[PDB]
Design an enzyme around this catalytic site. Structure first.
Site, PDB file in Angstrom:
ATOM      1  N   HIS A  62       0.918  -1.260   0.077  1.00  0.00           N
ATOM      2  CA  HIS A  62       0.141  -0.095   0.165  1.00  0.00           C
ATOM      3  C   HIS A  62       1.032   1.227   0.104  1.00  0.00           C
ATOM      4  O   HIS A  62       0.446   2.201  -0.532  1.00  0.00           O
ATOM      5  CB  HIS A  62      -0.891   0.183   1.003  1.00  0.00           C
ATOM      6  N   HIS A  92       6.408   6.929   6.276  1.00  0.00           N
ATOM      7  CA  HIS A  92       5.839   6.539   5.139  1.00  0.00           C
ATOM      8  C   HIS A  92       5.111   7.932   4.370  1.00  0.00           C
ATOM      9  O   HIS A  92       4.649   8.793   5.069  1.00  0.00           O
ATOM     10  CB  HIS A  92       4.911   5.275   5.072  1.00  0.00           C
ATOM     11  N   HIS A  94       1.952   9.144   1.404  1.00  0.00           N
ATOM     12  CA  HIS A  94       0.775   8.912   0.506  1.00  0.00           C
ATOM     13  C   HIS A  94       1.010  10.057  -0.508  1.00  0.00           C
ATOM     14  O   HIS A  94       1.187  11.014  -0.293  1.00  0.00           O
ATOM     15  CB  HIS A  94      -0.427   9.247   1.407  1.00  0.00           C
ATOM     16  N   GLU A 104      -3.725  13.251   2.411  1.00  0.00           N
ATOM     17  CA  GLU A 104      -4.787  12.764   3.203  1.00  0.00           C
ATOM     18  C   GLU A 104      -5.543  13.882   3.790  1.00  0.00           C
ATOM     19  O   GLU A 104      -6.779  14.104   3.813  1.00  0.00           O
ATOM     20  CB  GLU A 104      -4.353  11.674   4.210  1.00  0.00           C
TER      21      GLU A 104
HETATM   22 ZN   LIG Z   1       0.042   7.312   6.787  1.00  0.00          ZN
END
Ligand SMILES: [Zn+2]
Length: 258
Positions: A62, A92, A94, A104
């Site tokens: 992911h 990490h 996105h 996000e």
């Molecule tokens: Zn995250």
């Protein structure tokens, strides 16, 4: 048929396996900057990364995680809204398929090209797996990415991505300094929320920095060459691995600055 980011298993489907997806303190949210309240009792963040010990980078299907040794107080977050000491376990990102989306959190409904999450767990609970079962178990430092100049401190991450193209691949990743990913200012917004991937547990104190960092178009283009799939499975580019904003419900976002 497990969760992911496609047409048939994306964020709008997660509630069937993870009913807490429709819960009272889900993340991310839109940050309405005019409605956030200055909270003058909010102390400065203490980001202590001088002894950080990175170990490895992993494509988990992911995103990719840069993992740290969290068996001692080596890279810790304190202060701000936090009580106690939170240890860095991984970071990490996105990101989007296009520069116009990928973050996000949003700010007055504005989407950034990507968002970095530095994940920390409260040492009073002993390990990460116990911490995620507690309402104050995690502290996640969120940093927006916009496309413009390169971020020199990101380039060592960019350059190893070829070695972890597909799900389940990892590579040694020692001596990486996460201080090179921070913006100049630590002004932030904070609210109580959740993990943004399943199991979506409501264990996070979010600390979202106001100042974005700037990465180059070449840097983000290398993120978009990763794959969601495993080696020898059909290629699916790892892009648009972001959960959209969730309802704020009975929460107030506080600001450390005016
Ligand atoms: Zn995250």
């Amino acid at each position: 048929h497990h969760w992911g980011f496609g047409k048939h298993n994306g964020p709008e489907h997660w509630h069937k396996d993870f009913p807490i997806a429709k819960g009272e303190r889900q993340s991310p949210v839109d940050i309405d900057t005019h409605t956030a309240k200055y909270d003058p009792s909010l102390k400065p963040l203490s980001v202590s990364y001088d002894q950080a010990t990175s170990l490895r980078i992993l494509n988990n299907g992911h995103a990719f995680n840069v993992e740290f040794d969290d068996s001692q107080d080596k890279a810790v977050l304190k202060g701000g809204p936090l009580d106690g000491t939170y240890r860095l376990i991984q970071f990490h990102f996105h990101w989007g398929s296009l520069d116009g989306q990928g973050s996000e959190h949003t700010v007055d409904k504005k989407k950034y090209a990507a968002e970095l999450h530095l994940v920390h767990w409260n040492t009073k609970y002993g390990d990460f797996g116990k911490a995620v079962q507690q309402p104050d178990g995690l502290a996640v430092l969120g940093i927006f990415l916009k496309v413009g100049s390169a971020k020199p401190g990101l380039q060592k991450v960019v350059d190893v991505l070829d070695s972890i193209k597909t799900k389940g691949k990892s590579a040694d990743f020692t001596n990486f300094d996460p201080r090179g990913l921070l913006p100049e200012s630590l002004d932030y917004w904070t609210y109580p929320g959740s993990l943004t991937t399943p199991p979506l547990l409501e264990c996070v104190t979010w600390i979202v920095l106001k100042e974005p960092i700037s990465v180059s178009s070449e840097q983000v283009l290398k993120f978009r060459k990763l794959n969601f799939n495993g080696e020898g499975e059909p290629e699916e580019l790892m892009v648009d691995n972001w959960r959209p904003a969730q309802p704020l419900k009975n929460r107030q976002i506080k600001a450390s600055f005016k």
